[PDB]
């Protein structure tokens, strides 16, 4: 039940669940949700809300799709903006971004706090201090920006960044990171429309694996 159940993946780690996988947790309003726990990376206990690996799932989707979530437990997914708000409402959550290139190199970025607001505030990004990591810092530039999709433009550009750049993100004018962009498979000639993290591999290289995840601070 909600009374005795886990709130997040750290609670599950503490209860002796040591392998990564899908588990039921209870949101602050006691609604049950099935989530992916990363128990292996950097001490474990992370709740994963985005995962790319192979380009099998189309990420160029509308407001509705990003609001509710889409994809597969067996592969690539976005957990859903309503879900991500709920998960980050209580206490304080640290953010980790894990990346792998096609040459086999693993890179990461960590932030000391992370929250997204409710739909009334367009799922606005509230981001704390950059801690470090081999991937460098390409998200601070997005702090305090609304979320935008192709059919709903909340960015700070006279243009439509989500359409430019073929993704969905807390776009500014327009981005330093674009992890929901096209699965372009390494180097690409088109500018800034792939799975890009500009502080590491720049605007013309699309990563093999991307993963975004949270843990109580």
The least CB distance from residue 160 to Ca ion, in Å, is 5
Could you give the string, one character per residue 13-52, with x where binding to ligand A2G holds by CB under 6 A and - elsewhere? ----------------------------------------
How far is residue 96's CA from residue 161's CA, in Å, rounded to a whole number? Answer: 24
Residue 202: partners with Cβ closer than 8 Å, 6 or more residues away:
196
Based on the shown chain and the rule CB under 6 A, indicate whether residue 99 belongs to the binding site for ligand A2G: no
First and final CA of the chain: distance in angstroms?
A: 25
* Alpha helices (H) in the chain, listed in sequence order: 9-14, 63-68, 81-88, 161-164
Based on the shown chain and the rule CB under 6 A, indicate whether residue 175 belongs to the binding site for ligand A2G: yes
Cβ proximity to Ca ion, 175 vs 208, nearer residue: 175
Does 173 carry a binding-site annotation? yes
Contact 178, 165 (CB under 8 A): yes
Could you give the string, one character per residue 155-174, with x where binding to ligand A2G holds by CB under 6 A and - elsewhere? -------------------x
Residue 74: partners with Cβ closer than 8 Å, 6 or more residues away:
none
Based on the shown chain and the rule CB under 6 A, indicate whether residue 192 belongs to the binding site for ligand A2G: yes
Based on the shown chain and the rule CB under 5 A, indicate whether residue 151 belongs to the binding site for Ca ion: no
C-alpha distances out from residue 182 to 20, 46, 58, Å: 27, 25, 8
Based on the shown chain and the rule CB under 6 A, indicate whether residue 85 belongs to the binding site for ligand A2G: no
Cβ proximity to ligand A2G, 61 vs 175, nearer residue: 175
Please report where in the chains the tokens 């128990």 appear, as a residue.
39
Q: Give the residues lining the site for ligand A2G (CB under 6 A).
A: 174-175, 192
Q: Give the residues lining the site for Ca ion (CB under 5 A).
A: 153, 155, 157
């Amino acid at each position: 039940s909600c009374a005795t159940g886990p709130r997040n993946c750290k609670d599950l780690l503490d209860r002796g669940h040591f392998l990564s996988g899908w588990h039921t947790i209870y949101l602050p309003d006691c609604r049950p949700l099935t989530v992916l726990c990363d128990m292996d990376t950097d001490g474990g206990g992370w709740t994963v809300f985005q995962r790319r690996m192979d380009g099998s799932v189309d990420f160029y989707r509308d407001w509705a799709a990003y609001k509710q979530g889409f994809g597969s437990q067996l592969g690539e997914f976005w957990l859903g903006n309503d879900n991500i708000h709920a998960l980050t409402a209580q206490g304080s959550s640290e953010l980790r971004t894990d990346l792998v290139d096609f040459e086999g190199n693993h890179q990461f970025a960590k932030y000391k706090s992370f929250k997204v607001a409710d739909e009334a505030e367009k799922y606005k990004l509230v981001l704390g201090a950059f801690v470090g990591g081999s991937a460098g810092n390409s998200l601070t530039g997005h702090n305090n920006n609304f979320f935008s999709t192709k059919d709903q433009d909340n960015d700070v550009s006279s243009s439509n960044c989500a359409e430019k750049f073929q993704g969905a993100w807390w776009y500014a004018d327009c981005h330093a990171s674009n992890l929901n962009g096209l699965y372009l498979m390494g180097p690409h000639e088109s500018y800034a429309n792939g799975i890009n993290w500009s502080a590491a591999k720049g605007y013309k290289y699309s990563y093999k694996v991307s993963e975004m995840k949270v843990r109580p601070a």
